[PDB]
Short mmCIF file of C-alpha atoms in Angstrom, two decimals:
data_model
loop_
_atom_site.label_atom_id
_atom_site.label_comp_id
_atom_site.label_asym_id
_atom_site.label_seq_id
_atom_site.Cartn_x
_atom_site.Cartn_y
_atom_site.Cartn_z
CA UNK W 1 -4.38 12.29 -17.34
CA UNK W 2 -1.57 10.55 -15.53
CA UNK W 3 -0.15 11.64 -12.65
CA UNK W 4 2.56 10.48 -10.60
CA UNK W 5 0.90 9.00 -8.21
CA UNK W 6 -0.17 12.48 -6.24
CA UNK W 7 1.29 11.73 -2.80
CA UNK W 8 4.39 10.28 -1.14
CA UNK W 9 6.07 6.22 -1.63
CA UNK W 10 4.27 4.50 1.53
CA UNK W 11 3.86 1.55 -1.14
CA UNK W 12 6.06 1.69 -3.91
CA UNK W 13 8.17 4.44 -5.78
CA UNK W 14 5.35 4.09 -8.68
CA UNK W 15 7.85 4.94 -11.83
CA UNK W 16 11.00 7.07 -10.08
CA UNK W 17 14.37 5.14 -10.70
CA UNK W 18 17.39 5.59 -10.17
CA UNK W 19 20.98 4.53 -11.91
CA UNK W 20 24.95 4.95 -11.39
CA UNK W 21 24.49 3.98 -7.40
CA UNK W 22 24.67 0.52 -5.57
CA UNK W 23 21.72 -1.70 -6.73
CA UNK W 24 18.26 -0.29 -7.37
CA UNK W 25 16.50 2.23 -4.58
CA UNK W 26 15.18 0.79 -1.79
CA UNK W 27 11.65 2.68 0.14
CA UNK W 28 9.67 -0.02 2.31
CA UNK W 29 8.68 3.43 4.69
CA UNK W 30 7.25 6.18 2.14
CA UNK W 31 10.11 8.08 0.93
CA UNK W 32 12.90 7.57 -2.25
CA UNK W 33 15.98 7.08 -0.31
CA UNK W 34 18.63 6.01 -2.80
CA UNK W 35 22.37 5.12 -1.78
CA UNK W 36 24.13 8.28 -3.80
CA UNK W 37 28.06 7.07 -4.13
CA UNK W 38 30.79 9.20 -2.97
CA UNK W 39 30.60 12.83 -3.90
CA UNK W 40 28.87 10.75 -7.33
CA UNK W 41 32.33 11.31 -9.62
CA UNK W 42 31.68 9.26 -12.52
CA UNK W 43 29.68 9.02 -15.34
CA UNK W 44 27.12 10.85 -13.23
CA UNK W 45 24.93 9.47 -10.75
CA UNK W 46 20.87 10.76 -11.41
CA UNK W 47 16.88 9.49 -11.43
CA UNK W 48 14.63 9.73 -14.43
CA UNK W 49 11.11 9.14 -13.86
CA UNK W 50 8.92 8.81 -17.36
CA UNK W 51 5.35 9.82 -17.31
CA UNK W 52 4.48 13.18 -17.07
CA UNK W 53 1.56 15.54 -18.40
CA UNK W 54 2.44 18.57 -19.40
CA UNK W 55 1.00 20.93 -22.73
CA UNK W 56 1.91 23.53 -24.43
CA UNK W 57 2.06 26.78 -21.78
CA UNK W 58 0.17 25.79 -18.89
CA UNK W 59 0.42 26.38 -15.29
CA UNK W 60 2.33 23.35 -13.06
CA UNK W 61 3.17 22.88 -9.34
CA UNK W 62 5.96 20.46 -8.04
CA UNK W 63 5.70 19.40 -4.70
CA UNK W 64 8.38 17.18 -3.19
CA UNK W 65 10.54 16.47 -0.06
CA UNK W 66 13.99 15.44 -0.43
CA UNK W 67 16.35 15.57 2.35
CA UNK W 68 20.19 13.89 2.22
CA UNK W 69 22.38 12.77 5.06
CA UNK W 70 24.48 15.47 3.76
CA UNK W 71 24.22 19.09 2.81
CA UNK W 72 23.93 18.02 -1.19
CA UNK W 73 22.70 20.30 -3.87
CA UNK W 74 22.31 18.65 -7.13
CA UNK W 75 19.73 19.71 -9.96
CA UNK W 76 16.31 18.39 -10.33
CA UNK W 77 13.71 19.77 -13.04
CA UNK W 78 11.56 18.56 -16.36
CA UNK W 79 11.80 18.45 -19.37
CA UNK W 80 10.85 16.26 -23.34
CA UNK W 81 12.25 12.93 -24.03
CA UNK W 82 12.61 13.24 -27.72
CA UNK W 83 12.40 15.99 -30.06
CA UNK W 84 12.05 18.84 -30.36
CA UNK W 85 12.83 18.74 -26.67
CA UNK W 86 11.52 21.64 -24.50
CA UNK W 87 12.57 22.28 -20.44
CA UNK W 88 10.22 24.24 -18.40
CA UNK W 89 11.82 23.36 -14.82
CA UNK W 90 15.26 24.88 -14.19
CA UNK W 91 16.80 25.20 -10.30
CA UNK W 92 19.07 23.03 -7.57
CA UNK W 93 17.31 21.02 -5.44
CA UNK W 94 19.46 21.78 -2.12
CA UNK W 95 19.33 18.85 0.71
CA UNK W 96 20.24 18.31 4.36
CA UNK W 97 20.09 15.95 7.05
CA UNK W 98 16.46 17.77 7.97
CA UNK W 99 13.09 17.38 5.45
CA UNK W 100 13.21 19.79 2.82
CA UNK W 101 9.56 19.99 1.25
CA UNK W 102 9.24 21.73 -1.90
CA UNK W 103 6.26 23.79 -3.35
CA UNK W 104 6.51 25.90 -6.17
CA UNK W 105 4.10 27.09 -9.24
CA UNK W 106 6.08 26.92 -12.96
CA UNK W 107 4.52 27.69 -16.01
CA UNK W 108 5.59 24.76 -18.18
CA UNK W 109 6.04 26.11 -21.69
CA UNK W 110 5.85 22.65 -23.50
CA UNK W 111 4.31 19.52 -23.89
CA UNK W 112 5.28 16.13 -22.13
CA UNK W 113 2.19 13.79 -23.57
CA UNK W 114 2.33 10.64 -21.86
CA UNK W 115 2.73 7.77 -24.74
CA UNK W 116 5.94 6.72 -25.24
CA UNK W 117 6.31 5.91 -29.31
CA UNK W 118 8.83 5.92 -31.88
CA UNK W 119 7.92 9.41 -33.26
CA UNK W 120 5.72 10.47 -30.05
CA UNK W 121 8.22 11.37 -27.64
CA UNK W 122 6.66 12.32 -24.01
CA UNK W 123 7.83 14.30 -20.83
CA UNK W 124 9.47 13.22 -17.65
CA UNK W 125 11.01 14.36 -14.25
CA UNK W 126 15.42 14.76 -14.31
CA UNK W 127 17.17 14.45 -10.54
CA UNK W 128 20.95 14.50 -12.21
CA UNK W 129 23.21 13.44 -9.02
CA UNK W 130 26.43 13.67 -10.85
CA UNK W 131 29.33 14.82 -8.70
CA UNK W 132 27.14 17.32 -6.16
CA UNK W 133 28.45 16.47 -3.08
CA UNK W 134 31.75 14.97 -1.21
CA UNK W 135 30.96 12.36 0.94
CA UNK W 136 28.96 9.47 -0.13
CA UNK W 137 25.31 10.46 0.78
CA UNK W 138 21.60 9.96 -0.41
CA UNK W 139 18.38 11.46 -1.51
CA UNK W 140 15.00 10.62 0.31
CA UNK W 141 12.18 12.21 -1.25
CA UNK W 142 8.22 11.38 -0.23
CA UNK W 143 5.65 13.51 -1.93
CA UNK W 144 5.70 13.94 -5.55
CA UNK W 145 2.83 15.53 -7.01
CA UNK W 146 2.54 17.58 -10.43
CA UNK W 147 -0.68 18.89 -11.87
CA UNK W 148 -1.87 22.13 -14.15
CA UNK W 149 -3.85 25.15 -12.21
CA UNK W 150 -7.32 23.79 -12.69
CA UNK W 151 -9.27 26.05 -10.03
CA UNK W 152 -11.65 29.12 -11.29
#
């Protein structure tokens, strides 16, 4: 129904954002690069980006390219914004100072509908930066696209 804009940021970040970092992110190229503060120890530095379509058991793939000045391995995966909650993604998203594309096929056992109401809850995308690595570094993604195995 609604992607996330299948394809990189060569025009705007579409919904990723970011928080606990210096101002918003900043693209203006085609790739999320977001200012991650030294090795992120705080509250927890992170990205959430709402608007997702996911059901029940189906078949997923997540394709994306982050790559940090530094060697930083935080967590990225998916998951339910609002009961009964349900994650289907589940691994570190290692980076480096080279592009690191990513391309895997997860059977998402839940449901992330896409309309955002007080007892509708929905599904979304979770890049927690929260103390990962030392140095102040960054994230730069450019090619985010999720959709269910449609082909037979």
């Amino acid at each position: 129904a609604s992607p996330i804009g299948e394809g990189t940021f060569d025009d705007g970040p579409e919904g990723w954002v970011a928080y606990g970092t210096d101002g918003p992110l900043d693209t203006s190229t085609g790739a999320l690069c977001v200012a991650v503060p030294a090795g992120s120890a705080q509250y927890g530095v992170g990205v959430v980006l709402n608007g997702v379509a996911i059901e029940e058991g189906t078949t997923y793939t997540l394709r994306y390219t982050a790559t940090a000045s530094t060697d930083v391995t935080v967590r990225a995966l998916v998951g339910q914004n609002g009961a009964p909650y349900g994650t289907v993604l589940d691994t570190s998203p290692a980076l480096t100072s080279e592009p690191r594309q990513v391309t895997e096929t997860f059977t998402a056992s839940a449901t992330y509908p896409a309309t955002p109401a007080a007892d509708d809850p929905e599904g979304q995308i979770a890049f927690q930066l929260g103390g990962f690595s030392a140095d102040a570094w960054t994230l730069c993604l450019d090619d985010v696209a999720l959709d269910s195995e449609v082909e037979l």
